[PDB]
Amino acid sequence: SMQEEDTFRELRIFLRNVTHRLAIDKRFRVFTKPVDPDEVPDYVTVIKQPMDLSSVISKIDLHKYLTVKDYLRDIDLICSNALEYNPDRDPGDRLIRHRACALRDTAYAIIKEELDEDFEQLCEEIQESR
Ligand SMILES: COC(=O)c1cc(N)cc(-c2c(C)noc2C)c1
Ligand SMILES: [Cl-]
């Protein structure tokens, strides 16, 4: 219905705002664009599903997220990819892992504070009905 399309449009608006707030945070700069193959050529061979915040914005706009849970799966993938690819003890790896965990935790905390659980539930029920 038009009511349902309005619900998904509101979801997109909400997700874009959250993603923008993550993307402008200087700690998360490394997650704002895909990893550069020129710089890291083995990335695309090791990490099977690359994800970054620009790709997340693209996916919102393509209506790929019908629930906050679908969205958080991609935030989680940004984080898990960084933990997997940078697992070492050295400071460079430890810094990126800390930032990756912060990205994930920040996204979850924004959603916890600002998403009404009944709004998420409605999205889930519309999605499940399709
Ligand atoms: C576009 O992404 C970057 O600018 C960038 C920069 C650094 N220093 C590391 C990484 C990176 C990520 C994210 N995951 O593994 C590496 C290496 C990406
Ligand atoms: Cl830095």
Swiss-Prot record:
Free-text tissue specificity from the UniProt record? Highly expressed in estrogen receptor positive breast tumors and in osteosarcoma tumors.
Where is the Bromo domain positioned along the sequence?
3-114
Supply the induction statement. Answer: Up-regulated in breast, uterus, colon, ovary, and stomach tumors. Induced in breast cancer cells overexpressing NCOA3 or treated with estrogen. Down-regulated in 5-fluorouracil-resistant derivatives of the colon cancer cell line HCT 116.
Q: What subcellular locations does the record give?
A: Nucleus
**Coiled-coil segments, which residues?**
108-130
Q: What is annotated about its quaternary structure and interactions?
A: Interacts with ESR1 and NCOA3 and these interactions are enhanced by estradiol. Interacts with acetylated lysine residues on histone H1.4, H2A, H2B and H3 (in vitro).
**What does the UniProt function comment say about this protein?**
May be a transcriptional coactivator of the nuclear receptor ESR1 required to induce the expression of a subset of estradiol target genes, such as CCND1, MYC and E2F1. May play a role in the recruitment or occupancy of CREBBP at some ESR1 target gene promoters. May be required for histone hyperacetylation. Involved in the estrogen-induced cell proliferation and cell cycle progression of breast cancer cells.
Give the similarity note.
Belongs to the AAA ATPase family.
Q: What is the name of the protein in this document?
A: ATPase family AAA domain-containing protein 2
Instruction: Give the organism's phylogenetic lineage.
Output: Eukaryota, Metazoa, Chordata, Craniata, Vertebrata
